[PDB]
Subunit: 360 residues, 2 copies
Amino acid sequence: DSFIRQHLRKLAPYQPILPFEVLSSRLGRKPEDIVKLDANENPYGPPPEVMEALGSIRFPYVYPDPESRRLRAALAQDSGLESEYILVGCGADELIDLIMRCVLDPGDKIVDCPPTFTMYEFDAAVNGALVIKVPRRPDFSLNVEQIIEVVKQEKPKCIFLTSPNNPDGSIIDDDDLLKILELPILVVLDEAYIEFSTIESKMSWVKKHDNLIVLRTFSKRAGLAGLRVGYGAFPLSIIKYLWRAKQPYNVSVAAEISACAALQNPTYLENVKDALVKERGRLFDLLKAVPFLKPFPSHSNFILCEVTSGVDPKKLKEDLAEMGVMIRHYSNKELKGYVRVSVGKPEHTDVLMNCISRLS
Amino acid sequence: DSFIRQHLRKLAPYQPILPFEVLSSRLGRKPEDIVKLDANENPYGPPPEVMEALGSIRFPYVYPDPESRRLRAALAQDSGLESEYILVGCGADELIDLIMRCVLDPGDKIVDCPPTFTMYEFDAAVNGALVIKVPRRPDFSLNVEQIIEVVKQEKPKCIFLTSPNNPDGSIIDDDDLLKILELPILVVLDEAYIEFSTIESKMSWVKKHDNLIVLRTFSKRAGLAGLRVGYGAFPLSIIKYLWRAKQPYNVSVAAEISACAALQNPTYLENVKDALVKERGRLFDLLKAVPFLKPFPSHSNFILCEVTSGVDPKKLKEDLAEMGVMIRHYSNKELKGYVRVSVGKPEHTDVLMNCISRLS
Ligand code: NA
Ligand code: NA
């Protein structure tokens, strides 16, 4: 006997990560003495305009703009896409869930391509949808032929596709995306890490494909993960319904103000992106030399390593955490054989390699 | 054709209110010269500790605590209820929707007692639930006998009950609430405005009633509407399921930091509440003298007026907006005959009354 819906009674929970203040208690270290490479956060922080704006919020006691129109105007200029195509969310996480709750009736089907962002499987479960897993190949590329086959057989309503992918950082070729867009399915391209690549954003494609959505975030390159602000490009025929169903005030005044302030400093954003891309190469080479790690090529701000040579990947992550360095390990069957190392400052890499050298 | 779920194609949108920056552009007035009494916001703002904390956020680039445990510890101290019973939301709005998402399959029934908070109807529609209406009496009291009868007839899953109610401010007495708690239904008591009354919060009652949830907010008395932080008390048998389905990071770092900072100044919170309660009495007497307004007694930070004597309520609100004063009008059938006036500073009341005189 419970008021809870049946499909939620055995829901597998999401496995989130924990911030510095909580880690400090668990690890017995001050925050400045913890190297945190488990959530793809930008260790340089956001542009200095952000903390100046956050400290001078004029109307914290007034509800935010339900249309986030100031930020959407800035995103229209930034992206080259008109503001009528743009929604802002409490993170891109809000938009992932919003799409599912507006498109998937209970029992509808969604395609997922693991190993990938585990939020898609979680959100599908919360929304009562049924996941069709079409695994990526060993090089993390999409199996386009099998996607076509399952779409024909089972008529799923949507597919989420990360590029650069989390957790390996590989990109989806234009021709693969175009082949999938020919299918009668809603395609959600998640460009959370696109700024770390030389590939252009496909936001503009939504004007030519009424079955494409493109999602973006301020949480990674822009250094605003704590403030919860993301956005996306949507076809006009979809966005009109999403506006009606979207919660009025999930995008806070701090979120809108911080994102607008970050966009005032393109030089800072480019410089921190370039520093992280440079360190990614140095980190890759250092990890490759470790005998029990096999890193994969990446276009993001993280490097995935297969853990080899009989080394226990979970124990590796736990041992490193005890030494003060956090990397990411997932328990999902598709991911548990890897660890994912975010790119930080050069000194963060140096601490990680020092800790690796003292293992066992 | 459309990817959007069928039930959302006919969805009536929520009617939100708009912040000072948007009103300034629409009305052609500086924010200083707009008197904003339409959203129950606290014009004094939050305690000074809030701006000091927001300007010194250490980790804006790091995800927030998915468990909001620091704030929950502070709320345990404030409420006398252990932290295991407490969830924090991106506003109480998040918790209202979370409860419905977790309890209502499409077609499940929810009881509503209008005239009341229109977010319950909106969220029921977004979630695909069926509303069972039991209107309040003309004095805004619940028709308890009719609730009992309709629960037997329709077998609903839950009921939301606001006290002090929005939009009139009346309280639900203990005898009536206990009678409803005897029913086989989940009862959600919305205490958004309880601090403006002399009635104690019923958060502690969740320990003796596993079909009671009590919701609260920082948006009103505490002056944090823009930061999006609310909370509630939940039975342990329910909260374990809600934790699993709750989005991991909707409560931002700014929300948790600002709420914790506000709780550090109970003197300020009490003083601003007392100033607003004092002005509520002055406003009530002034509105009562207006020949075409009939105010209702209130325990909140707003006063509802029936618009009488043939005066158009919508035109009244629009005429006042053209003079620089915003009050609340709803198009809903049960609400369109009234206007709702929030309690502000004394000077705000004085501007309102000047504008009312200019329409008489
Ligand atoms: Na190696
Ligand atoms: Na009167």
